């Protein structure tokens, strides 16, 4: 039952011995946009509780999620100083609302959680990441041989139609997607004409994104066989990082690549720069 | 469109009325020359057009590129009046002696459609071929022919039939016996040294050569093309220069 | 022609808004506007047919009233279209209780006889008068047919039929499966049809001649506005029908003739 | 497919269709009647247009307006429900018979002169008197066929109900068309055909009354006599130039 | 408007003070100047909008597509006030240029997204002009109805039905006659300076428009503000997928030669 594992998560969050609570402060800071990155170490978990670090190792993609979605509902009562910023974003939600008058958990989301490799994971070369590790958490280290520059790149979007007045969303979950061409709104559908609705770029949402490629070390790869490359994607405050020609550990997730036979990838969780 | 129909008349009447010092109509004896095989584009001067009617003269050098297919066919007109010629020949119009001289550089968006004059050295030349100037749809599910079809610098069809039956979405045979084709060339021209303004490269343009004035400018000579500027095809864009005549000095 | 002339996309729609005004600007003797109150007694008893009287609309528009004798199908089919529009203009929910609305022509000036209808009269309107003998009972005919294609499964667009031929399938947009083509039951349209035959009046028959009689074609409203031995003014278009039984039986070429109805009244 | 959907929703309302209330006690209307049947060697149900409205206003719209397929969804779900409901079935009876639906509502009657052309295909209600009838005929269902020459068999080929047929292949997959049907690998149903005539009273004066074609299939046979009143529930259907014989595929009779 | 705090009259109020109480109204005697000058445009200096009000700065800097607008039209006012007997080809267009650039090359997040940044690098390559369709004509093929349509939001709608005939897919878009405007591209490469070591310089292109057009020359380092501007890519040109990450241009407003 995931409820269950949402539960457990959340009374780890909640109380964490140290009795400091850095998750709490930490949830606190980000409820005042203080922090976003927040890194989830696994140790606390097996310290714990080691079978919920198991089942998370085995599938860190809706494990994710649920301490994503546990860290959302904690925040609500955490912020005390309100807030002090100006975001083009909340400005935007603000003037809705006031029309409104007159939303999916990503859309209002701003904290990117990250998971931290237990201390008994051991790292691995390229060459020892096979097809038995996909969707598992796996610790690769080598040699960075290029970077790219950051963009951005759509998570959810946000269109809006001149017949209505109903914003509509549009989660992006692929690498491409088809933008929507007719508003499906029901005042629209009542009409019998869905409107030529727009995207609004200034309602939607944007992540930072960087893409490198990670070698093998000469030393470690066999004399007769040549070295092997890997792409890893860099998402969040992990972006900018790291350069090339730099010694690096990262630590991530090994998925593939859709677009029987197919392209991986590295979603990257923690970077170090060893050496 | 009255300015179109006014432009024309007006021109048809310069034609029939212009007289010289001679006090004779030069254009008949051009038309004479329009009776034979082999001639298609006429001569005039934008300066009698100005003693003429300076107002009419200001009205082409408005809207050169809308007004230029009444001329034609004013002039086709006249020609066939003239002289007996069959009915499918085509007559074309060339402008001479047009002072407003302009640079390479002053080409611009808001040029698009009026009358210039530009100068520049030949860098290469293409072979003549055929243009397809209007062309013949036939319907595929009634048979309906749809004649003089214009062609805006791509292969251009309509949905519709000359009978209020059908609507076809694609189905538009085209006919070569109905059609009309024109000679077309397409040279390169570079910015001349004495234009050529510091620190800058030669920016050279594209020229579309038509009717007689075809084959006429060799490589590596100064010549003044005078003609129109029009845009030639998200919608992809780019700019063209169309010269009606071409003269050495 | 006056059918190459009432064709002209320009002269159609001279027409039409010509047969607007006269439907929304047209008063009576008194000023009262005479078609408001017939398109309220008709969407009140929830029918599909509005009467019109020739003598004014030869009052309001002659040029519409040449035309209508020599052209009478596209003229008329022009005249449902504007009518339906000014109903529902005036009656914007009326789409639900009918789908069509028909245009009757009232008080021809025109009238003639069955024994003197020639090659003249072919595709005019005319107006007879006679006596029913026969009426058929009112069977389904197929007015807006949708083939379908075996190759692709779509089903292609409405092709009308008329009743003087069988009607073919057009051309799939890419399969051309044009044999392999049947007819859906559900998607298609039907209509009304009864086929009555009129005769001369008893008094009106010359003693040496004999009765002659005619065949009429009734269609939607019309069905059931007659019952043999009835006597009736009936105004429609005059239609020539190949009919190759009797160029056989004869011996020489000859042809059918029937008549479209369009207005029947009962004296 | 949306079929299985519908499917799925006749059996929901089949299986789920409750009548009373908790102050006395609850019985499932249409399972029992079906077990019962079943049971009784009788195959068929009368199933009323309010209940299905009631449960499921959809459902009952779509059977009022495109009575072919849906009433054949609800006939194999019928069988499918029939089937679970008497699952451990007698040594001989593993097989399942088909279950024949039939329908019933209490609408206002219309009159056969009302039948316009726009109701073609759609569920009628029109009473009558019976003049006429026909013997008890043989109409196929499941037919299988085989080829002349190569005697190849292309088996349980299905055939639509009412006066439908089947055009059978050219191609033999030898000449042309060498395809003839097995006699005996047939299985055949009842038929009958009847003739209703309007009422004395809706007759208009001075004028005969008229007509219409009814079909009557399986257990819907022997069931009226000439002179008798009955109130038809049929859907309207077709069998000069483009004209078309219309008649009425019965599926409910209220003998009066 | 919509999600934005902008507000017409009160920025132009603001700004036609400002003009009027920048004492340092030397932007009233630079439209002075101006009145005699015959170009209408007038270059303004960030910093005087934030000491004037901190408030409209934010305002201006956050949502440069509308204050910018708001901004010509009050100093188009003042300027009639104070000249109304001048005479000019045009309106005034106000580019509030920036001192510093605030930013480098890089770190340019993508919340910078349409707002006003300035930058500074070298000019590398500039292409040539590009026309670009501003108001279509829509020509109807059944009536010969010709229309005027004009741009909005960049999506031009086309009617199929006509507006005399009322006949769909009649009316046909004559580019020919539609009006255009000029576009410009250059490359802009970085600064030795904010080049962090052993980096390769890095290339950002520039949009220039109108008068901007052949204003910058290949081997000259100058400074550039304009809006930082991104915009999707499809995956095929058949195709209408769009991919996730978008490209990103600079949409120039001022260009100090530095
Ligand atoms: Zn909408
Ligand atoms: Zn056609
Ligand atoms: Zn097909
Ligand atoms: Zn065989
Ligand atoms: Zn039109």
Redesign the interface.
């Known amino acids: 039952d995931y409820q269950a594992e949402k539960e457990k998560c959340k009374t780890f969050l909640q109380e964490f011995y140290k009795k400091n609570f850095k998750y709490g402060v930490q949830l606190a800071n980000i409820a005042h946009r203080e922090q976003v990155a927040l890194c989830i170490d696994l140790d606390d978990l097996a310290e714990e509780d080691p079978e919920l670090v198991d089942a998370i190792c085995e599938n860190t993609r809706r494990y994710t999620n649920l301490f994503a979605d546990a860290v959302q509902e904690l925040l609500p009562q955490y912020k005390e100083r309100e807030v002090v910023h100006?975001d083009?974003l909340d400005?935007?939600?603000?003037?809705?609302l006031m029309?409104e008058q007159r939303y999916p958990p990503e859309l209002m989301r701003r904290f990117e959680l990250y998971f931290k490799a237990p201390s008994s994971s051991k790292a691995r070369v390229v060459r020892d990441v096979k097809a038995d590790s996909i969707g598992k958490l796996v610790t690769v280290r080598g040699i960075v041989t290029r970077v790219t520059?950051?963009?951005?790149?759509?998570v959810v979007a946000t269109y809006?139609c001149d017949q209505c007045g109903a914003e509509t969303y549009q989660p992006?979950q692929?690498?491409?997607?088809?933008?929507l061409i007719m508003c499906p709104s029901r005042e629209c559908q009542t009409n019998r004409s869905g409107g030529?609705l727009?995207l609004?770029?200034?309602?939607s949402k944007?992540?930072?994104?960087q893409e490198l490629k990670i070698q093998e070390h000469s030393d470690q790869v066999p004399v007769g066989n040549i070295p092997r490359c890997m792409s890893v994607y860099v998402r969040g405050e992990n972006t900018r990082l790291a350069?090339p020609?730099d010694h690096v550990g990262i630590t991530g997730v090994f998925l593939p690549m859709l677009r029987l036979l197919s392209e991986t990838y590295l979603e990257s969780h923690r970077l170090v720069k060893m050496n | 469109d009255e300015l179109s129909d006014k432009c024309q008349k007006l021109f048809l009447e310069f034609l029939e009325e212009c007289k010289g010092k001679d006090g004779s109509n030069l254009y008949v004896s051009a038309a004479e020359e329009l009776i034979r095989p082999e001639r298609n584009t006429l001569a005039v001067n934008f300066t009698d057009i100005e003693y003429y009617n300076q107002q009419l003269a200001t009205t082409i050098q408005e809207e050169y590129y809308r007004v230029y297919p009444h001329l034609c066919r004013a002039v086709r007109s006249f020609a066939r009046q003239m002289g007996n010629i069959p009915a499918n020949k085509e007559f074309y119009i060339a402008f001479s002696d047009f002072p407003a001289r302009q640079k390479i550089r002053e080409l611009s968006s808001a040029k698009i459609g009026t009358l210039l004059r530009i100068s520049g050295q030949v860098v290469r030349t293409h072979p003549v071929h055929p243009e397809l100037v209007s062309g013949t749809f036939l319907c595929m599910d009634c048979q309906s022919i749809v004649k003089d079809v214009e062609q805006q610098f791509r292969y251009t069809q309509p949905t519709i039939c000359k009978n209020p039956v059908c609507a076809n979405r694609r189905r538009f045979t085209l006919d070569t016996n109905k059609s009309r084709f024109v000679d077309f060339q397409k040279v390169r021209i570079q910015e001349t040294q004495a234009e050529l303004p510091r620190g800058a490269i030669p920016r050279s343009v594209e020229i579309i050569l038509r009717a007689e004035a075809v084959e006429s400018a060799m490589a590596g000579d100064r010549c003044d093309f005078t003609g129109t500027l029009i845009v030639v095809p998200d919608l992809s864009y780019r700019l063209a220069f169309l010269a009606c005549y071409v003269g050495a000095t | 022609t006056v059918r190459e002339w009432v064709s002209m996309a320009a002269t159609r729609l001279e027409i039409y808004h010509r047969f607007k005004n006269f439907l929304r600007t047209h008063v009576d003797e008194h000023g009262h506007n005479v078609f408001k109150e017939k398109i309220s007694d008709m969407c009140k008893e929830n029918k599909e047919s509005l009467p019109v009287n020739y003598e004014d609309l030869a009052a309001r528009e002659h040029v519409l009233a040449y035309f209508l004798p020599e052209a009478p199908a596209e003229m008329l089919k022009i005249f449902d279209e504007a009518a339906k529009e000014v109903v529902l203009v005036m009656y914007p929910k009326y789409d639900r209780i009918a789908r069509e609305i028909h245009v009757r022509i009232s008080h021809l000036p025109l009238v003639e006889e069955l024994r003197s209808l020639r090659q003249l009269h072919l595709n005019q309107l005319i107006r007879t008068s006679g006596v029913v003998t026969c009426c058929t009972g009112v069977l389904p005919q197929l007015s807006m047919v949708k083939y379908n294609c075996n190759k692709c499964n779509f089903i292609l667009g409405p092709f009308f039929q008329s009743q003087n031929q069988e009607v073919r399938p057009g051309s799939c947009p890419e399969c051309q499966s044009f044999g392999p083509f049947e007819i859906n039951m559900e998607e298609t349209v039907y209509q009304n049809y009864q086929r009555i035959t009129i005769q001369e009046s008893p008094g009106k028959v010359a003693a040496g001649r004999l009765p002659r009689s005619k065949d009429a074609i009734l269609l939607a409203d019309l069905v059931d506005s007659c019952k043999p031995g009835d006597e009736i003014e009936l105004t429609g278009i005059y239609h020539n029908n190949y009919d190759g039984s009797l160029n056989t039986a004869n011996g020489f070429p000859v042809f059918a003739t029937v008549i479209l109805a369009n207005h029947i009244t009962k004296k | 497919a949306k079929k299985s959907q519908l499917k799925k929703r006749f059996r929901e309302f089949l299986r789920q269709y409750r009548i009373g209330t908790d102050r006395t006690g609850f019985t499932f209307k249409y399972r029992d009647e079906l077990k019962r049947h079943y049971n009784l060697g009788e195959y068929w149900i009368e199933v009323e247009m309010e209940d299905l409205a009631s449960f499921d206003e959809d459902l009952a719209d779509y059977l009022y307006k495109q009575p072919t397929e849906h009433l054949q969804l609800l006939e194999e779900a019928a069988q499918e429900v029939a089937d679970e409901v008497t699952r451990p079935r007698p040594a001989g009876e593993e097989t399942i018979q088909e279950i024949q639906v039939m329908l019933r509502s209490d609408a206002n009657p219309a009159n056969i002169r009302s039948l316009k052309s726009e109701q073609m295909s759609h569920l009628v209600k029109i009473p009558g008197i019976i003049i006429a009838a026909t013997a008890v005929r043989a109409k196929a269902t499941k037919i299988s066929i085989q080829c002349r020459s190569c005697r190849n068999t292309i088996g349980n080929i299905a055939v639509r109900p009412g006066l439908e047929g089947y055009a059978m292949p050219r191609k033999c997959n030898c000449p042309l068309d060498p395809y003839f049907i097995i006699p005996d690998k047939c299985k055949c149903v009842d038929f009958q055909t009847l003739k209703l005539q309007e009422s004395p009273d809706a007759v208009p004066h001075g004028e005969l009354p008229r007509h219409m074609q009814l079909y009557c299939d399986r257990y819907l046979c022997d069931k009226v006599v000439p002179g008798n009143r009955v109130t038809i529930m049929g859907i309207y259907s077709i069998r000069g130039v483009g004209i078309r014989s219309s008649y009425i595929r019965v599926v409910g009779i209220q003998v009066d | 408007i919509?999600?934005?705090?902008v507000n017409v009259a009160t920025c132009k109020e603001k700004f036609q003070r400002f003009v009027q109480r920048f004492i340092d109204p030397i932007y009233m005697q630079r439209l002075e100047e101006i009145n005699v000058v015959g170009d209408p445009f007038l270059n303004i200096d960030c910093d005087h909008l934030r000491n004037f009000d901190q408030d409209l700065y934010?305002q201006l800097v956050?949502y440069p597509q509308e204050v910018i607008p708001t901004f010509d039209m009050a100093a188009n006012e003042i300027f009639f006030e104070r000249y109304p007997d001048s005479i000019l080809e045009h309106q005034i267009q106000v580019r509030p240029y920036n001192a510093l650039k605030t930013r480098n090359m890089r770190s340019?997040?993508?919340?910078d997204?349409?707002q006003l940044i300035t930058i500074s690098g070298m000019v590398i390559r500039t292409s040539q002009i590009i026309p670009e369709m501003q108001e279509a004509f829509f020509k109807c093929q059944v009536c010969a109805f010709t229309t005027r349509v004009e741009i909005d939001?960049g999506?031009i709608?086309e009617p199929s039905v006509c507006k005399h005939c009322n006949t769909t897919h009649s009316m046909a878009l004559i580019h020919n006659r539609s009006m255009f405007s000029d576009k410009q591209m250059i490359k802009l490469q970085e600064s030795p300076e904010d080049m962090p070591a052993?980096?390769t310089p890095?290339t950002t292109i520039l949009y220039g428009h109108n008068d901007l057009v052949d204003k910058v020359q290949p081997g000259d380092r100058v400074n550039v503000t304009g809006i930082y501007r991104?915009v999707?890519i499809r995956?095929n040109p058949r195709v209408?997928?769009?991919?996730?990450?978008?490209?990103?241009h600079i949409d120039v407003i001022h260009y100090r030669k530095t």
């Open positions: 100006k083009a400005v935007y939600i603000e003037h809705r029309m520059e950051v963009k951005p790149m759509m809006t992006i692929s690498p491409t997607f088809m933008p030529r727009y609004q770029t200034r309602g944007f992540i930072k994104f350069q020609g | 919509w999600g934005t705090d934010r956050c340019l997040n993508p919340e997204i349409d939001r999506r709608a052993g980096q890095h991104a999707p995956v209408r997928n769009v991919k996730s990450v978008y490209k990103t």
